[PDB]
Amino acid sequence: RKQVSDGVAHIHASFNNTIVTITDRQGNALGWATAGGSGFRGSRKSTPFAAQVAAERCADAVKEYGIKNLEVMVKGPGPGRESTIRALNAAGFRITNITDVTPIPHXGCRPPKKRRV
Amino acid sequence: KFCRFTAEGVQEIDYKDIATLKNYITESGKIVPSRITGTRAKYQRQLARAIKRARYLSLLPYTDRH
Amino acid sequence: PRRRVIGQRKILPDPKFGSELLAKFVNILMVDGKKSTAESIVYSALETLAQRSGKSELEAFEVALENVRPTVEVKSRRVGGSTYQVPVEVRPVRRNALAMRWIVEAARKRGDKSMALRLANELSDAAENKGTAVKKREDVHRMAEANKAFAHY
Amino acid sequence: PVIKVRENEPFDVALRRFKRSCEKAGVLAEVRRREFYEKPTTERKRAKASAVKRHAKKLARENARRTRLY
RNA sequence: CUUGAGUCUCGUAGAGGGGGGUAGAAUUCCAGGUGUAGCGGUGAAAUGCGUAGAGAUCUGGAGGAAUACCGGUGGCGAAGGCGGCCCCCUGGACGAAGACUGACGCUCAGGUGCGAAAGCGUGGGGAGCAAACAGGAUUAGAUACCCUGGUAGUCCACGCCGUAAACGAUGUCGACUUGGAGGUUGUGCCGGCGUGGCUUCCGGAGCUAACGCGUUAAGUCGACCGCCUGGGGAGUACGGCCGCAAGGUUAAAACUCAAAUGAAUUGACGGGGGCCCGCACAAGCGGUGGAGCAUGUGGUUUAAUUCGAUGCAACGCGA
Ligand SMILES: [Mg+2]
Ligand SMILES: [Mg+2]
Ligand SMILES: [Mg+2]
Ligand SMILES: [Mg+2]
Ligand SMILES: [Mg+2]
Ligand SMILES: [Mg+2]
Ligand SMILES: [Mg+2]
Ligand SMILES: [Mg+2]
Ligand SMILES: [Mg+2]
Ligand SMILES: [Mg+2]
Ligand SMILES: [Mg+2]
Ligand SMILES: [Mg+2]
Ligand SMILES: [Mg+2]
Ligand SMILES: [Mg+2]
Ligand SMILES: [Mg+2]
Ligand SMILES: [Mg+2]
Ligand SMILES: [Mg+2]
Ligand SMILES: [Mg+2]
Ligand SMILES: [Mg+2]
């Protein structure tokens, strides 16, 4: 439907999953995809290949907005950070920006306890 | 190295002197470690106090992402 | 082995066609050192397949081998107590070794009467992607592609 | 780390500038360090252990340039 | 009397303490926009959340707690401890030059005060975390470790408790006894040359059971205090004192043993590390385990079923 052509790509890259969301520059989600919804569970969901496929799919989903030039917000420590941007550049977008937006507390709240495994 | 604040007779570091302080913060806005700049310990403390003051008055940012 | 110095072994070419590949095929078909039996089976199968395809012996062979040779397989690598099927590219020597082995196994678990006719029919079906040997190629390829995410250790 | 894609700068080179800006700001190490609470005793202990073994490494080294191997 | 001790002048560094204020980052919740099928979690899952629109993303708002970077075997403090920034009140330490008092000192049973965390009382507060608890897993079981939740509590004020591997497992004060490299903070003389405080690492003699300590002594001495006298019973019982309570503190005996213990040595072992090797895996080919039979063995049987071998390394073995 509508035409925007200047989007923002948000990559939420956790240890367990990767979520790719494309919005306009004002924050409105045009489309999204996830590694865990792109045909990958458990040991496969948390790999850079599953994130690449998720980013493929999210590019394929926002096709009918004619998005042409993308900004990239990367958030989180997970495997799917680099691969997602390498697949956004491939899918057809002109990546104009790459920022890390991982939230860092300046102290903040007490984290959960250490796992004993 | 070469702590620049000793060589120039510095008594205080003057948070209002933003031009000087910008040399000691990164692009993120974090204070550069004295092991990188070679600032002497006393002046590193003066510099930290000055940067925190300048940040409070919105002369320097806390972060790159405000 | 741990040490590593496996100097390769001289294999004669087949007498009738002078092909090292066909001699490897005879060796893979041979049972109990009875090479004369295996050569007679292979030559009968190749002559039959060439009459039923018109092509030639050592070309219909390489056409059946072409549709069975795997391109990528999976090796197990245990990580978290459990295992990761890791895709790895198959070396051409191993491509042909596995193609020949799968063709012979398929022709063995067939229903025609003699081994020569079973091998001829398996080779004919492999030249159009219809036998159990190309089914094994397809299964191996789909496993490697289902594990493509793990193409790293 | 906010890298601007520059003109005629291909993708690979800007991506590598971004990877180094991140690995320089230590985003990933800060994230890993904030995943679980660490008791102050554990914090002080790992700090002291790193100091002691860095010092021991410099000392063993500067005596290693006083020993011969063959 | 002035050298121990102390006063004054001038200056210095400091997360020293008490009180108040404030800033930015982030979590959670609340409302709203976009958007759609997943999210979350794990070794793998499930519980849980989500089409009643979650997760993601964006705008606004509420609230609590903690202060990234600086940051440092860096600093301060009697110890416990103390970390954003600003102001108010306030303690100690150190230096330089002198002036002043004139042994005013050291230690300290009993006494008195301070004293992490947990905990207790009253009143507030409650984001995040999280004993108990609940569910999901794992397991032979799993009152656990892992997961999803979650209440005290963690925060504040006041009052109590008085204990910690409250550790340097090293009481305090004073004197003396080769060095080397740093850290931090003063100061004289001109980056170089001195002189003070505190501090980290190595190491000499000496000391030590050894490990190690080594001018910040565990060296050489002096003053005073505290404490020990085999292991277990037991820091327990009884009594006293203290405490709202939990309990703290002081503190036995019977009985029982011939040890218990420290350091270091040689091995062996590790679900410690490193480096290598073997049909050890991997890559392969053919088997055994099923059938019938041969043969040995166990067992059972028998008058006797002769004796021996009987994890690998006995079982077509002595034969
Ligand atoms: Mg967790
Ligand atoms: Mg006393
Ligand atoms: Mg408490
Ligand atoms: Mg209370
Ligand atoms: Mg209450
Ligand atoms: Mg829990
Ligand atoms: Mg005690
Ligand atoms: Mg302590
Ligand atoms: Mg200590
Ligand atoms: Mg003690
Ligand atoms: Mg020493
Ligand atoms: Mg008692
Ligand atoms: Mg009592
Ligand atoms: Mg094998
Ligand atoms: Mg059998
Ligand atoms: Mg017998
Ligand atoms: Mg016997
Ligand atoms: Mg015997
Ligand atoms: Mg034997």
Side-chain angles (χ1 to χ4, degrees):
Chain A
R1 290 211 123 183
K2 253 163 87 41
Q3 296 324 108
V4 47
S5 100
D6 37 10
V8 167
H10 302 267
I11 306 125
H12 190 101
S14 68
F15 293 119
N16 279 329
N17 200 356
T18 306
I19 297 180
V20 187
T21 286
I22 283 169
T23 90
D24 39 66
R25 275 172 10 227
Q26 292 72 257
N28 287 290
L30 312 190
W32 61 269
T34 83
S38 295
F40 294 101
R41 294 323 295 176
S43 211
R44 315 233 303 292
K45 176 169 34 69
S46 60
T47 68
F49 187 83
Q52 147 176 343
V53 178
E56 286 175 2
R57 288 213 315 163
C58 172
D60 275 64
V62 307
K63 53 142 143 158
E64 209 174 43
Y65 293 80
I67 311 173
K68 208 263 173 218
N69 46 91
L70 265 184
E71 292 149 58
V72 177
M73 329 294 255
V74 205
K75 148 163 13 189
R81 299 158 50 87
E82 51 145 36
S83 98
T84 293
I85 322 175
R86 272 163 200 259
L88 291 156
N89 168 243
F93 291 107
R94 183 233 155 199
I95 323 290
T96 85
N97 254 306
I98 312 172
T99 315
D100 186 278
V101 293
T102 310
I104 301 310
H106 294 174
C109 301
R110 194 185 175 109
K113 69 194 179 170
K114 171 164 198 205
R115 312 180 61 236
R116 307 189 296 282
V117 273
Chain B
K1 310 314 118 169
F2 157 56
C3 179
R4 312 205 84 265
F5 299 99
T6 91
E8 283 146 25
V10 154
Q11 307 197 300
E12 278 80 8
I13 270 183
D14 204 6
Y15 74 94
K16 308 189 268 69
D17 181 11
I18 303 302
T20 302
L21 308 174
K22 265 184 167 64
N23 305 315
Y24 296 84
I25 73 188
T26 75
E27 255 36 86
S28 264
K30 301 168 53 153
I31 301 159
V32 181
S34 70
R35 72 186 294 180
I36 289 290
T37 60
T39 296
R40 256 67 140 191
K42 167 129 121 101
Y43 292 113
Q44 182 74 32
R45 298 198 296 286
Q46 280 185 38
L47 182 81
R49 272 172 227 122
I51 287 170
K52 294 158 191 206
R53 285 184 206 200
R55 286 169 172 169
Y56 164 78
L57 297 177
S58 205
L59 299 176
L60 301 170
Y62 286 83
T63 192
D64 38 356
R65 251 187 277 118
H66 276 296
Chain C
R2 305 188 182 282
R3 294 206 161 285
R4 156 73 242 170
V5 175
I6 302 334
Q8 244 324 310
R9 215 182 277 97
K10 184 184 192 164
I11 178 65
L12 286 51
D14 79 86
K16 208 200 238 186
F17 302 107
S19 160
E20 260 204 28
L21 217 80
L22 197 57
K24 196 85 227 183
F25 196 55
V26 175
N27 286 359
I28 282 144
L29 193 129
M30 175 172 55
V31 152
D32 300 325
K34 284 155 85 54
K35 185 167 280 198
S36 203
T37 309
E39 254 155 15
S40 99
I41 295 175
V42 168
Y43 292 165
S44 191
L46 287 190
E47 176 226 359
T48 282
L49 150 80
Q51 305 252 348
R52 309 207 308 217
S53 98
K55 208 98 202 312
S56 97
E57 296 96 338
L58 263 198
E59 299 230 50
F61 185 61
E62 322 281 18
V63 159
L65 277 203
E66 203 282 288
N67 298 150
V68 183
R69 282 191 274 244
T71 329
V72 52
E73 66 189 324
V74 279
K75 296 178 186 193
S76 262
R77 236 76 171 167
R78 192 199 48 71
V79 199
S82 317
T83 37
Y84 278 12
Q85 298 318 313
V86 186
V88 276
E89 45 272 293
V90 180
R91 313 116 52 203
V93 178
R94 190 164 152 74
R95 288 176 223 156
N96 278 312
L98 276 176
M100 288 176 210
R101 184 187 303 151
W102 295 346
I103 281 165
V104 171
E105 305 171 348
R108 280 200 189 133
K109 63 192 50 202
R110 257 176 111 82
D112 342 13
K113 286 199 174 123
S114 65
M115 185 51 174
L117 191 36
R118 283 176 286 224
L119 187 66
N121 287 349
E122 192 54 57
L123 287 174
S124 287
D125 299 312
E128 47 246 16
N129 307 59
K130 312 213 261 192
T132 43
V134 300
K135 250 298 192 274
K136 180 159 240 316
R137 188 259 293 151
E138 269 155 10
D139 270 88
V140 175
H141 271 174
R142 76 165 58 108
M143 257 68 251
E145 194 247 359
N147 287 285
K148 188 127 41 213
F150 289 133
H152 61 72
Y153 278 7
Chain D
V2 45
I3 265 42
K4 295 284 245 157
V5 175
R6 307 211 272 251
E7 260 49 39
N8 324 132
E9 168 149 20
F11 185 61
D12 164 37
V13 169
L15 196 47
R16 190 213 281 97
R17 181 157 41 107
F18 175 72
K19 283 209 235 326
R20 195 173 238 106
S21 187
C22 292
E23 248 283 342
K24 193 131 140 50
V27 201
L28 290 210
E30 184 94 20
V31 171
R32 284 217 196 80
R33 197 181 51 69
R34 292 179 181 271
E35 203 184 348
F36 302 110
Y37 179 75
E38 156 170 271
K39 289 211 296 175
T41 180
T42 306
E43 194 235 43
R44 290 180 302 251
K45 204 181 62 171
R46 63 142 166 58
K48 207 267 192 62
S50 100
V52 158
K53 251 194 309 161
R54 275 173 297 169
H55 193 76
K57 183 231 288 194
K58 302 224 322 270
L59 236 316
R61 204 155 49 146
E62 275 74 91
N63 305 110
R65 290 210 246 115
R66 317 221 291 275
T67 322
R68 91 193 271 176
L69 294 189
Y70 48 83

